Amino acid sequence: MWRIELKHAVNWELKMKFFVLPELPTPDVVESGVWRRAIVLDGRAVAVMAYPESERTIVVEGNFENREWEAVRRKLVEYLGLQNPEELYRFMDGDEKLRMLKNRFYGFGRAGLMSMSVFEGIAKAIIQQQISFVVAEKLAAKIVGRFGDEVEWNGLKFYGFPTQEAILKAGVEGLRECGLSRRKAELIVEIAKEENLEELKEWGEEEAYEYLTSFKGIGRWTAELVLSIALGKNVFPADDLGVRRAVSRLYFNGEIQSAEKVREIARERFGRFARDILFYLFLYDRFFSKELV
């Protein structure tokens, strides 16, 4: 048992609702409000699970060492988005439509990340190209099942996203076998060859953008999605069709707007909080719009 003590309440149920296929190891599994996965920690996979004991206290259990707690805690705070949302909430209150979003998903707090490594974030962004998020997540589950780490601890199985090494071994054909198009498989293997990839998190936005887009098959949308959802940078992915739909529904009474207009809105209304608001827009798009002939 370790405990993460928060200054502000978090709605755990809303944090978990963010997961699209909670039962399936994508690699994350959420079962009866308990989240778990295997994470690679100093070259070895460990079991980690987390669940609330109160509005302001998240319990963590796992088979890592006590001296590794500080590192694990930092990773979970950033990934699950547990940081004090007071200032975000104050800011959202100042805009009629943001206030509407804040209240619809109240207690969601700040945005986390959608991966526990840069490699995982890039691979998943590539998988998602030209397909729905639900289809992308099933593909992730196939790859995790065959090529990911597996840890058995207590009576429970913990799944991890494939290491760069595991992907290189899977190769193009192993990824194609799991359902990936040839080019996607090719690009993921390409990325797997890169050294020091976790350092990309600490690069500047513009440098990271030029690195990502320097790969053939990674364009503006994939690079901006990685920057925001994997790297934690305040880069707003306006080409995303779900984002365009949500912003149009909120501010333009459902009249579909261009990416350039959405960018303009984010600049004017979202400011330093655009990355947090982006996660609220994903929820809005999924849960209040995603007929009749």
List the single partner that 213 binds among Hg ion, Na ion, none, CB under 5 to 8 Å by kind: Na ion
List the single partner that 293 binds among Na ion, Hg ion, none, CB under 5 to 8 Å by kind: none
Residues preceding chain discontinuities in the chain with C to N over 2.5 Å: 290
Q: Using the minimum distance from each CB to Na ion, give the nearer residue, 71 or 134.
A: 134
Q: Is 218 in the site for Na ion (CB under 5 A)?
A: yes
Integer Cα distance of 86 and 134 in angstroms: 32
Among candidate residues 134, 133, 89, the one with its CA nearest the CA of residue 108: 89
Instruction: Label the pairing between strands 150-153 and 57-62.
Output: unpaired
Which of 28, 149, 240, 276 is the catalytic position? 240
Token pair for 138: 């099933």
DSSP code, position 39 = E
List the single partner that 1 binds among Hg ion, Na ion, none, CB under 5 to 8 Å by kind: Hg ion
Per CB under 5 A, the segment of 35-43, 169-177, 193-201, 208-216 that binds Na ion is 208-216
For residue 2, the minimal CB distance to Hg ion (Å) is: 5
Residues near Hg ion (CB under 5 A): 1
Integer Cα distance of 271 and 280 in angstroms: 15
For residue 210, the minimal CB distance to Na ion (Å) is: 10
Token pair for 229: 């959802």
Q: Using the minimum distance from each CB to Hg ion, give the nearer residue, 39 or 208.
A: 39
Burial of 153 (0-12, 13-18, 19+ CB in 10 A): middle
**CB-nearest residue to Na ion:** 26
For residue 39, the minimal CB distance to Hg ion (Å) is: 16
Integer Cα distance of 288 and 3 in angstroms: 34
For residue 49, the minimal CB distance to Hg ion (Å) is: 12
Token pair for 158: 């913990």
Q: Using the minimum distance from each CB to Hg ion, give the nearer residue, 38 or 88.
A: 38
- Asked if 281 and 247 touch (Cβ cutoff 8 Å), the reply is yes
Q: Is 240 a catalytic residue?
A: yes
Q: Is 28 in the site for Na ion (CB under 5 A)?
A: yes
Chain residues that interact with Na ion, rule: CB under 5 A: 21, 24, 26, 28, 213, 218
Any idea which residues carry the catalytic annotation? 240
